[PDB]
Design a binder for this molecule. Structure first.
Ligand code: NA
Lengths: 364, 5, 363, 5
């Protein structure tokens, strides 16, 4: 009610942008603003997740709290000139924003009505560089399901075991797995982070040198990075046993230049069925032939020089799944591990086993 | 399209 | 039948340009390909407009024609490596595209079924630099009516008078007019270019030094730029006269920095009504006060230093109409010409009368 | 909103 603060525009922008990340209830469209002991806290929530930003206050201030429309407040702050001093105070049930000769009066909702996230205890904690969390997410995110009825597939598995953190994502047709050493002995734990949580967690990594502190409870996950705290509910489901689906002992190995392979699959794709995306691979001695056809009886054929010595074989794949893997890999050469035409194929960088991709074929 | 599981 | 080999880079931009007008019938999704006397012609159409590109053939070729899916053929050519030689021939009802060890067989529709645009005679012709046509379109395009029942306002007026070419766009509330000298005496002529024609005409200007050749008939417009020919049907209606809405003898003049004015209207806009966008302007000696309020009793107030000596006045405007003008102008200072609160206002660059913007106020 | 014509 007596909440007062003055802060430079540039010290508000990134915090305002981060908290607006997570309606039906009017208060969920607001940001909770709190002034307490030299800090301004900003909180945004969708009930499933919340983002809290802390801004140090070097200019005079008075304690208190309020809720203000998020988009309107951010747009005012963003719309002000570079270097503007933003003076904020309450006057009745209105929030007053003043800068230069610009005055704004915004509607408020009491701070006491802002939804608090349910208290929980962390069961596993670890610290990680931001780049490690970024690599784990980026290497696997494209493999998560898109609004699948097996709801546990729409998120990403976060699994700790020994000194390692691993991410796993699948849609039941293709899978991605990334394992990274974290240098801290961890209890064995597995949780599913929802799609929106993964996006928010990725969006919070500024690409700087501040480490990420992760706390995982039974039904919640918390990530602290610099002056930001992101909390998300976990997906209440059981992830499939992905260990079962990695080819254990493949008898066929193919190696090819990533760029040439990606370009050939990209051109073949043009003439694949628009909904089904099926392409045929014919593997023979040091050769890969890629074919595609559609209901219009149009046909594409690509012939490439590869490294391959095994038995001749034909295998069908959804070309979008193959292209997704080739675009996720950023290496000179790729290696493909195969058994037969009705079994999964493993794809990986020919010089790194950090990330593995498993694609189930299509019936030809 | 075949299933992993 | 039709045969040609062409380097990828000689086909890319032509393929991109002809896919522009691009269906009700499957043939409209195709490009017409024709080989005749050392040239490959490529044509794309939506029945209202067409884009033709001509590509010189230096490698052996055989005459003929076919139609091929536009997006598929372009995507194949784009997808091939830089410097690829693209060999094309027909085999039955299929078009065969070969490059390196990449082979494509595309479905065809007969060239004889491709829709031809009706023959017409030009009544007015002129040449102008591409940058002049770009400036004329960009200065006025935002003011065109968005799917109005007065179909004639959905397009852009192209008017030749004396040695000048002018573009006019309006929605009945706000208007834009741009005039540019062309250095050729022209007959007085006015035509309405449809929205899609204006977009295609703008998309065809590569930003190079090749001049644009314009031909205008009674119901069609043609623009020639290098090896591209764009043709569009004209809107068959009568456009109103911009002269009638220009403020007659403005007694009030305001001058202000464009950026400061745009930023103040942008901030005020946040708290303006979401549907109505109403803002209030209070003009007084060397001062502009902008205010906005919405149904939830929220209020914004912006006070600015401007150049103004006239009588004090309050005037209401749709803030999106004002912001559209300020974003179209790319100048340091703007000038606003006014009479009263119930009459149009003229806005323009304080140092150029080439573009004028007329905005009707709100009660 | 006022009309131009
Ligand atoms: Na009047």
């Amino acid at each position: 009610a007596a909440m007062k603060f003055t802060v430079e525009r540039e010290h508000l922008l990134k915090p305002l942008q981060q908290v607006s990340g997570p309606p039906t209830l009017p208060i969920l469209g607001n940001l909770l603003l709190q002034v307490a002991d030299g800090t301004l806290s900003l909180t945004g929530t969708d009930l499933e997740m919340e983002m809290v930003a802390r801004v140090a206050l070097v200019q005079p201030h008075e304690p208190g709290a309020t809720t203000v429309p998020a988009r309107k407040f951010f747009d005012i702050c963003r719309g002000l000139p570079e270097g503007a001093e933003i003076a904020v105070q309450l006057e009745g049930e209105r929030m007053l924003v003043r800068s230069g000769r610009s005055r704004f009066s915004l509607s408020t909702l009491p701070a006491a009505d802002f939804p608090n996230l349910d208290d929980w205890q962390s069961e596993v904690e670890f610290t990680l560089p931001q780049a490690t969390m970024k690599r784990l997410i980026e290497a696997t995110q494209f493999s998560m399901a898109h609004q699948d009825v097996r709801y546990y597939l729409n998120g990403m598995l976060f699994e700790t075991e020994g000194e390692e953190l691993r991410t796993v994502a699948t849609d039941g047709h293709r899978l991605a797995v990334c394992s990274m050493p974290i240098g801290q002995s961890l209890p064995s734990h597995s949780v599913i982070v929802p799609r929106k949580g993964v996006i928010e967690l990725m969006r919070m990594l500024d690409g700087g040198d501040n480490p990420l502190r992760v706390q995982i409870g039974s039904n919640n996950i918390r990530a602290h990075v610099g002056d930001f705290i992101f909390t998300s509910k976990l997906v209440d489901g059981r992830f499939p046993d992905y260990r079962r689906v990695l080819p254990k002992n493949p008898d066929k190995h193919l190696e090819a230049g990533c760029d040439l392979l990606k370009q050939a699959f990209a051109r073949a794709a043009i003439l694949s069925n628009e909904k089904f995306r099926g392409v045929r691979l014919y593997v023979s001695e040091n050769q890969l032939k890629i074919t595609a056809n559609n209901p219009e009886q149009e046909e594409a054929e690509e012939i490439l020089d590869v490294t391959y010595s095994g038995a001749e074989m034909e295998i069908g794949f959804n070309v979008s799944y193959v292209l997704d893997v080739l675009n996720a890999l950023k290496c000179e050469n790729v290696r493909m591990m195969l058994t037969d035409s009705v079994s999964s194929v493993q794809i990986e960088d020919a010089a790194s086993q950090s990330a593995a991709y498993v694609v189930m074929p299509m019936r030809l | 399209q075949a299933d992993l599981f």
